[PDB]
Antibody, heavy 217, light 212 residues
Framework: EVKLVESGGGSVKPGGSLKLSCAAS????????MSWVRQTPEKRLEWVAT????????YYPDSVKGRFTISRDNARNILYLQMSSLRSGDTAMYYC??????????????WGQGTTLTVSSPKTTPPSVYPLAPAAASMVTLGCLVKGYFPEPVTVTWNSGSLSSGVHTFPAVLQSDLYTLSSSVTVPSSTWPSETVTCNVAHPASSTKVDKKIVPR | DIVLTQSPAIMSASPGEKVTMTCSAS?????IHWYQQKSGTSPKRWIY???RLAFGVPGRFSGSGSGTSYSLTISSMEAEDAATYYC????????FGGGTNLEIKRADAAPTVSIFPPSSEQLTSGGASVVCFLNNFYPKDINVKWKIDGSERQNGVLNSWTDQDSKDSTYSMSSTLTLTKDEYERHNSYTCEATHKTSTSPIVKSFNRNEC
């Protein structure tokens, strides 16, 4: 099967340099042109580079021309995106895409899974987890407020996977250049508080995992 | 310098109905192509050139257009289709449209509201967050007002919205009011209330601080 699998990225201070790579599988690399495309957190799609089948030609949009360089090595079936003098506008998830020829144009057939690139100057901060128990019916909604964390991907696992089917997770909204999210879970009254409910927050950017037994007020 | 604006940004269809989203260009264009993007996964190939379907896509999809106004049409809607559909041009600068959020439409649901006093843990730190969960409702457009001691507030409310549930096809919303410890203990009766095109009068949920 055609595979596109991209590597590199993360959190860089503005002004840093970086390099992204993407690895190809299950199709003849040299015979296709390869591009990168970025998507803003707000689900915005922007084309950023293109290389030809050989070396031949490169092409660039006018939002990065001068800072980015796109490269292939057809000995290994891998693209390269070096990005120099990164600024705040460069935050996005970056995909590598194959370009195929059509009747009179081109078209992006397969896209990899993207890596994420957060350009910013703030520290990496672990999250503060607070239990959300009530201060009267036959089903209980508990929660966990996960507050003040910087690098955005967090994870909330409830009783270690068990209660997935009744869990709402709410996208992290930014303010104070910290991220704040919430997660709710639902549970038959026969389950709580007779048995432990514990939400579990892990923050890979800091290697911090916190646990919180929801106990009743 | 060549913009595509895609016409209905959000759209709700029920299964069995026709769906037409549009992509209109700032100047004349030879062809336009469409991609599909579901939550958590990259865009996938959907329609290329104008009317040419990709191998995977069902036969109830369809494409057309010429010049400045092209359009993707769905013959009969099925719930498996809900995703964001982008267009893209290839004549000048490789520009993507803004997408069209395709939603499943179901019978309306009023939320299941739950209010939570700040934790004994946060308060000892200098802060107090009051949190409200409105759970499993449709449609999505809601208003939520928090009234403290009978008056109202909008400072420091953070409002978050799930993506549509893959089973009951609802939405969930959180609402968090971030006070200070001293600001929190200045009042007594914190109330969140939800207004919605289901119930006529709001769904109120309340607690009192000088109680615990």
């Amino acid at each position: 099967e055609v595979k596109l699998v991209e590597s590199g990225g993360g959190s860089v201070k503005p002004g840093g340099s970086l390099k992204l790579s993407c690895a190809a599988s299950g199709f003849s690399f040299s015979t296709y042109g390869m591009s990168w495309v970025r998507q803003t957190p707000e689900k915005r799609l922007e084309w950023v580079a293109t290389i030809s089948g050989g070396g031949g030609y490169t092409y660039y949009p006018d939002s990065v021309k001068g800072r980015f360089t796109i490269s292939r090595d057809n000995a290994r079936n891998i693209l390269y995106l070096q990005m120099s003098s990164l600024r705040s506008g460069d935050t996005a998830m970056y995909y590598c895409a194959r370009r195929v020829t059509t009747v009179a144009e081109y078209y992006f057939d397969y896209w990899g899974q993207g890596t994420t690139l957060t350009v910013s100057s703030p520290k990496t901060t672990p999250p503060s987890v607070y239990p959300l128990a009530p201060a009267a019916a036959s089903m209980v909604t508990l929660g966990c407020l996960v507050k003040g964390y910087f690098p955005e991907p967090v994870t909330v696992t409830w009783n270690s996977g068990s209660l997935s089917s009744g869990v709402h997770t709410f996208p992290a909204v930014l303010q104070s250049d910290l991220y704040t999210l919430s997660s709710s879970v639902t549970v038959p009254s026969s389950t709580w508080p007779s048995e432990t409910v514990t939400c579990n927050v892990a923050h890979p950017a800091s290697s911090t995992k916190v646990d919180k037994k929801i106990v009743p007020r | 310098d060549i913009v595509l604006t895609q016409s209905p940004a959000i759209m709700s269809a029920s299964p069995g109905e026709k769906v037409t989203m549009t992509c209109s260009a700032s100047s004349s264009v030879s062809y336009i192509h469409w991609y599909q993007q579901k939550s958590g996964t990259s865009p996938k190939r959907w329609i290329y050139d104008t009317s040419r379907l990709a191998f995977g896509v069902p036969g109830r999809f369809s494409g057309s257009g010429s010049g400045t106004s092209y359009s993707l049409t769905i013959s009969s809607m099925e719930a498996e289709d809900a995703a964001t559909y982008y267009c893209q041009q290839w004549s000048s600068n490789y520009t993507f449209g803004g997408g069209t959020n395709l939603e499943i439409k179901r019978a309306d649901a009023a939320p299941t509201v739950s209010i939570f006093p700040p934790s004994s843990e946060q308060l000892t730190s200098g802060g107090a967050s009051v949190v409200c969960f409105l759970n499993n409702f449709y449609p999505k457009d809601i208003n939520v007002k928090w009234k403290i001691d009978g008056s109202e507030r909008q400072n420091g409310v953070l409002n978050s919205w799930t993506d549509q549930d893959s089973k009951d096809s609802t939405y969930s919303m959180s609402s968090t009011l971030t006070l200070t410890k001293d600001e929190y203990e200045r009042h007594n009766s914190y109330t969140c209330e939800a207004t919605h095109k289901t119930s006529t009068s709001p769904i109120v949920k309340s607690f009192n601080r000088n109680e615990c």
